[PDB]
Design a binder for this molecule. Structure first.
Ligand code: SF4
Length: 81
């Protein structure tokens, strides 16, 4: 299974991830990216049909703020860092 989350401290709100994977990433009230699947908690398995879009967003994030793992983040974008 794959999980994903945005590090809100490092996101620079550059527009890339919503363009790459709009069914995974959008922008909060402040304009900062977040994962819509689970409100940035890193607890909903990414649907099969969205995995390729996830990969595009992951590689295309300039600050490496988008995280991907085989394990839930449960609210901590830095669980694996
Ligand atoms: S691609 Fe990365 S830095 Fe740009 S808005 Fe998305 S999470 Fe933030």
């Amino acid at each position: 299974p794959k999980y994903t989350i945005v590090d809100k401290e490092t996101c620079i709100a550059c527009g890339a991830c919503g363009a790459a994977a709009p069914d995974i990433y959008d922008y909060d009230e402040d304009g900062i990216a977040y994962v819509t699947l689970d409100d940035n908690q890193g607890i909903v398995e990414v649907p099969d049909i969205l995995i390729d879009d996830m990969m595009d967003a992951f590689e295309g994030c300039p600050t490496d703020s988008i995280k991907v793992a085989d394990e839930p983040f449960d609210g901590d974008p830095n669980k694996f860092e």
